Amino acid sequence: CNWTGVKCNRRGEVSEIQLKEKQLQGSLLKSLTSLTLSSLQLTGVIPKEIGDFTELELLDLSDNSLSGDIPVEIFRLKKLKTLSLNTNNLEGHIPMEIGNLSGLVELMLFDNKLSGEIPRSIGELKNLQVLRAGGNKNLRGELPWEIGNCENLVMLGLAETSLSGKLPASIGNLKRVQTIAIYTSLLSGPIPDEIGYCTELQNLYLYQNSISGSIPTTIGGLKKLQSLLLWQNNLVGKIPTELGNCPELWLIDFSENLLTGTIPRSFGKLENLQELQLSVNQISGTIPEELTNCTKLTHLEIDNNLITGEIPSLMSNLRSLTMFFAWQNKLTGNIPQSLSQCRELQAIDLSYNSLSGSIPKEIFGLRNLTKLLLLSNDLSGFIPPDIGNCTNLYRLRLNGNRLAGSIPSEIGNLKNLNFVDISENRLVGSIPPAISGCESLEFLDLHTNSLSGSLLGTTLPKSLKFIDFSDNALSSTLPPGIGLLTELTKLNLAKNRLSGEIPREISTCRSLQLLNLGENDFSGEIPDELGQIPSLAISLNLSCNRFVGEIPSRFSDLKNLGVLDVSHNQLTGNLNVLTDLQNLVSLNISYNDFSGDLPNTPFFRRLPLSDLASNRGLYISNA
């Protein structure tokens, strides 16, 4: 009568039942109109007696655990307008008799276990507005031609299904359709030109299919188009110039296709464009200056293409740009200082180009720039002192250039700087003490430079994890202060001029996985405390030095060490201390003064006879 969830007619008969989110279990009045049992965690099949309520205009079974078929009897309900079966375990085909529900408007099948094809019957439903069957992995076959007959369709989505083949030319008859969502599916073949007949189309999402052919020109005649996602297909040919005729277009994603040709000039006419992703294609030509007319661009990603020429200075007119990725192209010329006029830039990646000249200091005045990636170019000149103005810098990669001069002290003003790679450059001088001021610094890669001078523990921040100073001119002694970095994981000092002993303070680096001291002037005796780091796992490289004395007994403790190179030293005595490392994989003992017999165990038998031949007395004794 009046209780909670019940509604009645004017003649006094129960007309409605609504139950939402009550936490139940299990399975489940001929005047009924609306029936909602939803979010009740119900189970079992849908009883086929549902087809007995003839006045039902709404059936919502959504957000349950229901299983089995969608009973054919459900389609006996001739007055049904909404059918909501989504978010269940429902299996089987969508029955042909679905074409019988003459006045269906809403049809929600999404997120189920459904299979088979979509019935040619859907064409009969001429009041159908919304069809969403997506998220059924096994829904297969071609979208039927008859879909063209549902002329009230405003929304179609079939996403994450096995729907395949090519979209039918019939689609051009849906003159009211607004969103088409069929993505992460099996679609192949070309987008039909007839799609340009969908005059109300706003959102077209075809991404992650096998779609082939070229983007049809006809798409330019769609005046209501806002978002176009065609990323990750097989698309071929040139970007249609006519795309620049859709005034309302704010998002274009063509990434990861086979596109060629040029970025079209007509794009300047798109006054609403906020996001352009062309990443991973074959696009040639230069970035057209008219693109700088797109006042609203936040995201520009043109990376992994064939683009040539210079980055235009009129870039300064994009005052909303937060993201610029051109990496892996043929770009040449200077990086324009005018790029510093886009004050919102969060991320710049120009890596893998031919850019040359100085890095303009103005770019370091950006207060929001978190990522600056210029690696692998022809850049040169100094790192500007202005680097310290760039307050939010997080990840900085300058590596693989010609940069000269010394690392400016003002880098120490950057408190958010996490990761810095300046490797492969011409940098000179000392590592500046002020870098101690980068309190967030985790990764530091200076390798393959002309750096020199000494090395102080006071010079480095204790939050360091990865250090690579290799292939430089560094000298004097490894500072005892090295013991203060307790977080240090990989440490690579190789191919330098370093000398003296290994300071025993090394033992207090409790996290150290990798230590490369190779190709230096280190001398004396490998300290016992070097055994004292059980975290040493990945590799320990002491080779090409002047070390003497024996392998300290404590090396029996490094039970995790996979790779050990002591080669090319003056080391003496035998290998017995090593016989017990079962995790030792690679051992290079060659070019030393070792003598004595190795056991015949398979590991020592593995060692190349030529490695034994460069020592004093080493041989395999048979037990």
């Binding site: 978010t87 999404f110 997120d111 997506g134 998220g135 996403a159 994450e160 969502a181 993505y183 992460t184 959102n203 999402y205 991404y207 978002s227 996602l229 990323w231 990750q232 998002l251 994603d253 990434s255 990861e256 996001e275 992703q277 990443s279 995201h299 990603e301 990376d303 993201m323 990725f325 990496w327 991320a347 990646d349 890596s351 893998y352 990522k371 990636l373 690696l375 990669r397």
Partner: peptide, 13 residues
């Protein structure tokens, strides 16, 4: 549940 519409994820170095 199937994923909502997304753009191509951006990749940086």
């Amino acid at each position: 549940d199937y994923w909502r519409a997304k753009h191509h994820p951006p990749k940086n170095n």
